[PDB]
DNA sequence: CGGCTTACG
DNA sequence: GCCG
DNA sequence: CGTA
Protein backbone atom coordinates (compact mmCIF):
# COMPACT_ATOMS: atom_id res chain seq x y z
CA UNK A 1 0.00 0.00 0.00
CA UNK A 2 1.63 3.23 -1.22
CA UNK A 3 1.85 6.25 1.04
CA UNK A 4 0.22 8.81 -1.29
CA UNK A 5 -3.43 8.60 -2.33
CA UNK A 6 -2.52 9.42 -5.95
CA UNK A 7 -0.47 6.19 -6.14
CA UNK A 8 -3.42 3.83 -5.68
CA UNK A 9 -6.91 3.46 -7.14
CA UNK A 10 -9.68 4.53 -4.78
CA UNK A 11 -13.18 3.55 -5.95
CA UNK A 12 -16.33 5.37 -4.95
CA UNK A 13 -17.72 2.38 -3.03
CA UNK A 14 -15.53 0.03 -1.08
CA UNK A 15 -15.23 -2.56 1.68
CA UNK A 16 -14.50 -0.50 4.80
CA UNK A 17 -17.32 2.05 4.77
CA UNK A 18 -18.02 2.14 8.51
CA UNK A 19 -14.35 2.36 9.47
CA UNK A 20 -13.63 5.16 7.02
CA UNK A 21 -16.72 7.10 8.13
CA UNK A 22 -15.55 7.08 11.74
CA UNK A 23 -12.06 8.32 10.90
CA UNK A 24 -13.59 11.08 8.79
CA UNK A 25 -15.63 12.24 11.80
CA UNK A 26 -12.39 12.70 13.72
CA UNK A 27 -10.82 14.45 10.73
CA UNK A 28 -13.75 16.85 10.48
CA UNK A 29 -13.62 17.55 14.22
CA UNK A 30 -9.88 18.25 14.00
CA UNK A 31 -10.57 20.83 11.29
CA UNK A 32 -13.21 22.53 13.45
CA UNK A 33 -10.49 22.99 16.07
CA UNK A 34 -7.95 24.32 13.57
CA UNK A 35 -5.69 21.25 13.71
CA UNK A 36 -5.00 20.83 10.02
CA UNK A 37 -2.24 18.23 10.47
CA UNK A 38 -4.49 15.91 12.43
CA UNK A 39 -7.27 16.46 9.87
CA UNK A 40 -4.87 15.39 7.13
CA UNK A 41 -3.73 12.23 8.91
CA UNK A 42 -7.28 11.11 9.74
CA UNK A 43 -8.35 11.82 6.14
CA UNK A 44 -5.36 9.89 4.78
CA UNK A 45 -5.99 6.91 7.08
CA UNK A 46 -9.65 6.84 6.05
CA UNK A 47 -8.57 6.94 2.42
CA UNK A 48 -6.17 4.01 2.87
CA UNK A 49 -9.14 1.92 4.04
CA UNK A 50 -11.14 2.97 0.99
CA UNK A 51 -8.34 1.61 -1.23
CA UNK A 52 -8.19 -1.82 0.43
CA UNK A 53 -9.43 -4.82 -1.61
CA UNK A 54 -11.42 -6.37 1.26
CA UNK A 55 -12.83 -5.61 4.74
CA UNK A 56 -10.52 -5.10 7.69
CA UNK A 57 -11.64 -7.72 10.22
CA UNK A 58 -8.65 -7.92 12.58
CA UNK A 59 -6.19 -5.38 14.01
CA UNK A 60 -3.27 -7.28 12.44
CA UNK A 61 -4.49 -6.24 8.99
CA UNK A 62 -3.47 -2.64 9.80
CA UNK A 63 0.19 -3.69 10.07
CA UNK A 64 2.29 -1.91 7.50
CA UNK A 65 -0.53 0.34 6.33
CA UNK A 66 0.62 3.96 5.97
CA UNK A 67 -0.99 6.61 8.21
CA UNK A 68 -2.13 4.10 10.85
CA UNK A 69 -0.40 4.79 14.12
CA UNK A 70 -1.52 4.55 17.73
CA UNK A 71 -4.61 6.77 17.51
CA UNK A 72 -6.17 5.62 14.22
CA UNK A 73 -5.45 1.97 15.07
CA UNK A 74 -7.21 2.36 18.43
CA UNK A 75 -10.27 3.79 16.68
CA UNK A 76 -10.39 0.79 14.34
CA UNK A 77 -9.77 -1.63 17.20
CA UNK A 78 -12.74 -0.29 19.17
CA UNK A 79 -15.02 -0.43 16.12
CA UNK A 80 -13.97 -4.04 15.43
CA UNK A 81 -14.49 -5.13 19.05
CA UNK A 82 -17.60 -3.16 20.07
CA UNK A 83 -19.09 -1.68 16.90
CA UNK A 84 -18.67 1.85 18.31
CA UNK A 85 -15.69 4.05 19.14
CA UNK A 86 -16.24 6.08 22.31
CA UNK A 87 -14.19 9.06 21.09
CA UNK A 88 -16.14 9.21 17.82
CA UNK A 89 -19.50 9.03 19.60
CA UNK A 90 -18.48 11.76 22.05
CA UNK A 91 -17.60 13.98 19.09
CA UNK A 92 -20.90 13.16 17.35
CA UNK A 93 -23.05 14.26 20.28
CA UNK A 94 -20.96 17.27 21.31
CA UNK A 95 -22.50 20.72 21.04
CA UNK A 96 -19.27 22.06 19.55
CA UNK A 97 -19.18 19.53 16.71
CA UNK A 98 -22.88 19.74 15.87
CA UNK A 99 -22.90 23.55 15.76
CA UNK A 100 -19.64 23.89 13.84
CA UNK A 101 -20.95 21.31 11.36
CA UNK A 102 -24.24 23.19 10.99
CA UNK A 103 -22.60 26.60 10.61
CA UNK A 104 -19.85 25.56 8.17
CA UNK A 105 -22.51 23.92 5.97
CA UNK A 106 -23.77 27.43 5.19
CA UNK A 107 -22.55 28.76 1.86
CA UNK A 108 -20.28 31.67 2.76
CA UNK A 109 -19.32 30.41 6.24
CA UNK A 110 -15.98 28.74 6.98
CA UNK A 111 -14.43 27.44 10.20
CA UNK A 112 -13.20 30.86 11.35
CA UNK A 113 -16.59 32.53 10.95
CA UNK A 114 -18.42 29.55 12.50
CA UNK A 115 -16.00 29.48 15.45
CA UNK A 116 -16.52 33.19 16.16
CA UNK A 117 -20.29 32.77 16.12
CA UNK A 118 -19.93 29.75 18.41
CA UNK A 119 -17.84 31.75 20.88
CA UNK A 120 -20.47 34.51 20.81
CA UNK A 121 -23.05 31.92 21.93
CA UNK A 122 -24.89 31.33 18.66
CA UNK A 123 -26.07 27.76 18.07
CA UNK A 124 -28.91 27.54 15.50
CA UNK A 125 -29.71 28.88 12.05
CA UNK A 126 -32.53 30.92 13.57
CA UNK A 127 -29.97 32.51 15.92
CA UNK A 128 -28.18 33.76 12.80
CA UNK A 129 -31.40 34.90 11.11
CA UNK A 130 -32.13 37.11 14.16
CA UNK A 131 -28.74 38.86 13.74
CA UNK A 132 -28.67 39.79 10.03
CA UNK A 133 -26.16 42.56 10.77
CA UNK A 134 -23.62 39.77 11.35
CA UNK A 135 -24.09 38.41 7.82
CA UNK A 136 -22.52 39.13 4.46
CA UNK A 137 -24.79 39.09 1.41
CA UNK A 138 -23.29 35.73 0.45
CA UNK A 139 -24.08 34.35 3.90
CA UNK A 140 -27.62 35.72 3.74
CA UNK A 141 -28.12 33.82 0.48
CA UNK A 142 -26.58 30.65 1.95
CA UNK A 143 -28.79 30.94 5.07
CA UNK A 144 -32.04 31.55 3.13
CA UNK A 145 -31.35 28.66 0.71
CA UNK A 146 -29.86 26.32 3.33
CA UNK A 147 -32.73 23.82 3.34
CA UNK A 148 -32.66 23.30 -0.45
CA UNK A 149 -28.85 23.24 -0.47
CA UNK A 150 -28.93 20.46 2.18
CA UNK A 151 -30.90 18.23 -0.23
CA UNK A 152 -28.63 16.10 -2.45
CA UNK A 153 -28.40 16.97 -6.12
CA UNK A 154 -29.26 13.88 -8.18
CA UNK A 155 -27.48 12.65 -11.28
CA UNK A 156 -30.83 13.03 -13.07
CA UNK A 157 -30.76 16.76 -12.20
CA UNK A 158 -27.30 17.20 -13.73
CA UNK A 159 -28.21 16.54 -17.37
CA UNK A 160 -30.95 19.20 -17.34
CA UNK A 161 -28.61 21.75 -15.76
CA UNK A 162 -25.82 21.04 -18.24
CA UNK A 163 -28.15 21.65 -21.18
CA UNK A 164 -29.21 25.08 -19.86
CA UNK A 165 -25.58 26.03 -19.19
CA UNK A 166 -24.61 24.86 -22.68
CA UNK A 167 -27.37 27.02 -24.21
CA UNK A 168 -26.11 30.16 -22.46
CA UNK A 169 -22.48 29.29 -23.23
CA UNK A 170 -23.27 28.75 -26.91
CA UNK A 171 -24.76 32.24 -27.26
CA UNK A 172 -21.95 33.78 -25.21
CA UNK A 173 -19.30 32.22 -27.45
CA UNK A 174 -20.15 29.78 -30.25
CA UNK A 175 -17.87 26.77 -30.13
CA UNK A 176 -17.24 26.90 -26.40
CA UNK A 177 -17.73 23.61 -24.56
CA UNK A 178 -19.03 22.57 -21.14
CA UNK A 179 -17.48 19.59 -19.33
CA UNK A 180 -18.96 18.02 -16.21
CA UNK A 181 -16.29 17.84 -13.49
CA UNK A 182 -16.25 17.35 -9.69
CA UNK A 183 -17.90 14.46 -7.92
CA UNK A 184 -20.28 13.54 -10.71
CA UNK A 185 -17.36 13.02 -13.09
CA UNK A 186 -15.91 10.61 -10.48
CA UNK A 187 -19.12 8.58 -10.73
CA UNK A 188 -21.11 9.93 -7.78
CA UNK A 189 -24.86 9.47 -8.05
CA UNK A 190 -25.54 12.52 -5.88
CA UNK A 191 -23.72 15.64 -4.83
CA UNK A 192 -23.73 18.90 -2.85
CA UNK A 193 -23.40 20.85 -6.12
CA UNK A 194 -22.74 20.47 -9.85
CA UNK A 195 -19.30 21.47 -11.18
CA UNK A 196 -18.65 22.56 -14.78
CA UNK A 197 -15.48 23.44 -16.67
CA UNK A 198 -15.81 25.68 -19.76
CA UNK A 199 -13.25 26.22 -22.54
CA UNK A 200 -12.95 27.00 -26.26
CA UNK A 201 -10.74 25.13 -28.77
CA UNK A 202 -9.12 28.37 -30.02
CA UNK A 203 -6.65 29.63 -27.42
CA UNK A 204 -7.58 33.08 -26.12
CA UNK A 205 -11.20 33.03 -27.27
CA UNK A 206 -12.27 32.13 -23.74
CA UNK A 207 -11.05 35.48 -22.35
CA UNK A 208 -13.95 37.38 -20.80
CA UNK A 209 -16.37 34.49 -21.24
CA UNK A 210 -17.76 33.86 -17.76
CA UNK A 211 -19.31 37.36 -17.29
CA UNK A 212 -21.12 36.88 -20.60
CA UNK A 213 -22.35 33.44 -19.52
CA UNK A 214 -23.54 34.64 -16.12
CA UNK A 215 -25.41 37.62 -17.50
CA UNK A 216 -27.20 35.34 -19.96
CA UNK A 217 -28.18 32.89 -17.22
CA UNK A 218 -29.36 35.71 -14.97
CA UNK A 219 -31.46 37.12 -17.83
CA UNK A 220 -33.09 33.68 -18.17
CA UNK A 221 -34.15 33.96 -14.49
CA UNK A 222 -32.04 30.95 -13.54
CA UNK A 223 -29.62 32.54 -11.05
CA UNK A 224 -30.81 32.90 -7.48
CA UNK A 225 -27.41 34.19 -6.33
CA UNK A 226 -24.01 34.97 -7.75
CA UNK A 227 -21.20 37.29 -6.68
CA UNK A 228 -21.61 39.64 -9.68
CA UNK A 229 -25.45 39.73 -9.88
CA UNK A 230 -14.90 42.90 -13.09
CA UNK A 231 -13.28 40.15 -15.13
CA UNK A 232 -13.69 36.75 -13.47
CA UNK A 233 -13.14 33.11 -14.39
CA UNK A 234 -14.82 31.20 -11.54
CA UNK A 235 -18.39 31.59 -10.31
CA UNK A 236 -19.89 29.89 -7.25
CA UNK A 237 -23.60 30.37 -7.70
CA UNK A 238 -27.02 29.23 -6.66
CA UNK A 239 -29.27 28.12 -9.56
CA UNK A 240 -33.04 27.65 -9.90
CA UNK A 241 -33.62 24.02 -10.91
CA UNK A 242 -37.08 22.76 -12.00
CA UNK A 243 -38.92 20.24 -9.84
CA UNK A 244 -42.41 18.70 -10.22
CA UNK A 245 -44.83 21.67 -10.07
CA UNK A 246 -42.04 23.62 -8.30
CA UNK A 247 -38.28 24.43 -8.35
CA UNK A 248 -35.36 23.97 -5.89
CA UNK A 249 -32.12 25.90 -5.27
CA UNK A 250 -28.93 24.10 -6.33
CA UNK A 251 -25.28 25.08 -5.99
CA UNK A 252 -23.45 25.24 -9.33
CA UNK A 253 -19.74 25.96 -9.82
CA UNK A 254 -18.57 27.33 -13.18
CA UNK A 255 -14.90 27.62 -14.17
CA UNK A 256 -13.35 28.87 -17.43
CA UNK A 257 -9.88 27.76 -18.58
CA UNK A 258 -7.91 28.31 -21.79
CA UNK A 259 -7.60 25.12 -23.79
CA UNK A 260 -3.83 25.07 -23.09
CA UNK A 261 -4.65 24.71 -19.38
CA UNK A 262 -7.74 22.52 -19.77
CA UNK A 263 -6.06 19.19 -18.80
CA UNK A 264 -4.73 20.78 -15.61
CA UNK A 265 -8.07 22.39 -14.83
CA UNK A 266 -9.97 19.19 -15.54
CA UNK A 267 -7.58 17.28 -13.27
CA UNK A 268 -7.83 19.82 -10.46
CA UNK A 269 -11.60 20.34 -10.53
CA UNK A 270 -12.34 16.61 -10.84
CA UNK A 271 -10.94 15.94 -7.38
CA UNK A 272 -11.41 14.44 -4.99
CA UNK A 273 -10.16 17.25 -2.75
CA UNK A 274 -7.87 14.85 -0.89
CA UNK A 275 -6.72 13.22 -4.14
CA UNK A 276 -5.61 16.61 -5.47
CA UNK A 277 -3.87 17.63 -2.23
CA UNK A 278 -2.03 14.31 -2.30
CA UNK A 279 -1.17 14.67 -6.00
CA UNK A 280 0.23 18.17 -5.50
CA UNK A 281 2.19 17.03 -2.44
CA UNK A 282 3.56 14.08 -4.42
CA UNK A 283 4.55 16.32 -7.32
CA UNK A 284 6.46 18.79 -5.14
CA UNK A 285 7.99 16.44 -2.57
CA UNK A 286 8.78 13.38 -4.71
CA UNK A 287 9.31 14.90 -8.18
CA UNK A 288 10.30 18.51 -7.45
CA UNK A 289 7.57 19.89 -9.72
CA UNK A 290 4.87 22.39 -8.73
CA UNK A 291 1.31 21.42 -9.75
CA UNK A 292 -1.80 23.59 -9.75
CA UNK A 293 -5.02 23.91 -11.76
CA UNK A 294 -3.18 25.95 -14.43
CA UNK A 295 -0.08 23.88 -15.10
CA UNK A 296 2.96 21.96 -13.91
CA UNK A 297 6.13 23.94 -13.30
CA UNK A 298 9.74 22.75 -13.21
CA UNK A 299 11.40 25.29 -10.86
CA UNK A 300 14.95 24.34 -11.87
CA UNK A 301 14.43 24.64 -15.63
CA UNK A 302 11.86 27.42 -15.03
CA UNK A 303 9.63 25.72 -17.61
CA UNK A 304 5.98 24.64 -17.76
CA UNK A 305 5.00 21.20 -18.99
CA UNK A 306 2.63 21.24 -21.93
CA UNK A 307 -0.15 18.71 -21.48
CA UNK A 308 -2.78 17.69 -24.00
CA UNK A 309 -4.57 15.26 -21.66
CA UNK A 310 -4.84 14.12 -18.08
CA UNK A 311 -2.91 11.05 -19.24
CA UNK A 312 -0.03 13.41 -20.14
CA UNK A 313 0.04 14.78 -16.60
CA UNK A 314 0.14 11.38 -14.89
CA UNK A 315 2.98 10.41 -17.26
CA UNK A 316 4.90 13.62 -16.46
CA UNK A 317 4.67 12.74 -12.75
CA UNK A 318 5.68 9.09 -13.20
CA UNK A 319 2.30 7.86 -11.92
CA UNK A 320 0.09 5.12 -13.31
CA UNK A 321 -3.01 6.69 -14.84
CA UNK A 322 -6.16 6.71 -12.70
CA UNK A 323 -9.50 7.39 -14.36
CA UNK A 324 -11.80 9.81 -12.48
CA UNK A 325 -13.76 6.92 -10.94
CA UNK A 326 -10.58 5.80 -9.13
CA UNK A 327 -9.75 9.26 -7.73
CA UNK A 328 -12.30 8.96 -4.89
CA UNK A 329 -9.72 9.37 -2.14
C1' DC B 1 12.15 18.30 14.18
C1' DG B 2 9.46 20.37 9.77
C1' DG B 3 5.91 19.44 6.93
C1' DC B 4 1.13 19.05 5.74
C1' DT B 5 -2.26 21.87 -1.92
C1' DT B 6 -2.76 25.94 -4.11
C1' DA B 7 -5.29 29.10 -6.64
C1' DC B 8 -9.21 32.94 -7.58
C1' DG B 9 -13.66 36.16 -5.77
C1' DG C 1 -1.49 12.42 13.69
C1' DC C 2 1.64 10.57 11.32
C1' DC C 3 5.97 10.41 7.98
C1' DG C 4 10.64 10.90 6.62
C1' DC D 1 -12.49 36.42 4.87
C1' DG D 2 -14.91 33.29 1.39
C1' DT D 3 -14.84 29.76 -2.59
C1' DA D 4 -12.52 25.62 -4.96
N1 LIG E 1 -6.37 21.57 -5.04
C1 LIG E 1 -7.60 21.76 -4.55
N2 LIG E 1 -8.66 21.38 -5.27
C2 LIG E 1 -9.83 21.65 -4.63
C3 LIG E 1 -10.01 22.24 -3.40
N3 LIG E 1 -11.37 22.33 -3.11
C4 LIG E 1 -11.97 21.81 -4.15
N4 LIG E 1 -11.08 21.38 -5.11
C5 LIG E 1 -11.37 20.75 -6.38
C6 LIG E 1 -11.49 19.24 -6.32
C7 LIG E 1 -13.00 19.02 -6.25
O1 LIG E 1 -13.40 17.78 -6.80
C8 LIG E 1 -13.51 20.17 -7.11
C9 LIG E 1 -14.92 20.61 -6.82
O2 LIG E 1 -15.56 19.60 -6.01
P1 LIG E 1 -16.53 19.99 -4.82
O3 LIG E 1 -17.75 20.53 -5.51
O4 LIG E 1 -15.80 20.90 -3.88
N5 LIG E 1 -16.75 18.51 -4.17
P2 LIG E 1 -17.08 17.17 -5.03
O5 LIG E 1 -17.66 17.49 -6.37
O6 LIG E 1 -15.97 16.16 -4.96
O7 LIG E 1 -18.28 16.54 -4.18
P3 LIG E 1 -19.67 17.21 -3.69
O8 LIG E 1 -19.84 18.45 -4.52
O9 LIG E 1 -20.74 16.19 -3.94
O10 LIG E 1 -19.49 17.53 -2.23
O11 LIG E 1 -12.62 21.27 -6.84
C10 LIG E 1 -8.88 22.64 -2.65
O12 LIG E 1 -8.86 23.17 -1.53
N6 LIG E 1 -7.68 22.36 -3.31
K1 LIG F 1 -19.35 26.78 4.07
MG1 LIG G 1 -19.15 19.13 -6.52
MG1 LIG H 1 -18.11 22.54 -6.38
Name some characteristics of this structure.
329 residues; alpha+beta; five-stranded mixed β-sheet; three-stranded antiparallel β-sheet; 10 strands; 47% helix; globular; binds ligand XG4; binds potassium ion; binds magnesium ion; DNA-binding; nucleotidyltransferase; DNA damage; nucleus; DNA repair
Commentary on this structure:
The chain has helices at residues 17-32, 36-51, 70-82, 86-93, 95-104, 111-119, 125-129, 137-144, 146-149, 155-172, 182-185, 209-219, 262-270, 273-287, 310-316, and strands spanning 153-154, 177-181, 190-191, 194-199, 223-225, 234-243, 246-256, 290-292, 295-298, 303-304. It is α+β, with helices and mostly antiparallel strands and 329 residues long. The protein folds into four domains: 1-94, no CATH class; 95-151, no CATH class; 152-259, no CATH class; 260-328, no CATH class. The strands form three sheets. The chain has a five-stranded mixed β-sheet, sandwiched between helices. β9 (295-298) and β10 form a beta hairpin. The structure holds the ligand Nc1nc2c(ncn2[C@H]2C[C@H](O)[C@@H](COP(=O)(O)NP(=O)(O)OP(=O)(O)O)O2)c(=O)[nH]1, potassium ion (K) and magnesium ion (MG) (2 copies). The site of one magnesium ion has 4 residues, from loops. The structure holds three DNA strands.
Amino acid sequence: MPAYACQRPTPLTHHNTGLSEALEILAEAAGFEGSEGRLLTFCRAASVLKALPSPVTTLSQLQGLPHFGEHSSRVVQELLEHGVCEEVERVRRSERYQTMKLFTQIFGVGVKTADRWYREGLRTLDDLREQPQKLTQQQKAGLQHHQDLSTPVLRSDVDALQQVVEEAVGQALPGATVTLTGGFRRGKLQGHDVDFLITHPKEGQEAGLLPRVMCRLQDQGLILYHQHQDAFERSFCIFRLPQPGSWKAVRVDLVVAPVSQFPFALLGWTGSKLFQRELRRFSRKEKGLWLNSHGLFDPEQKTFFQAASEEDIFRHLGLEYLPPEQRNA
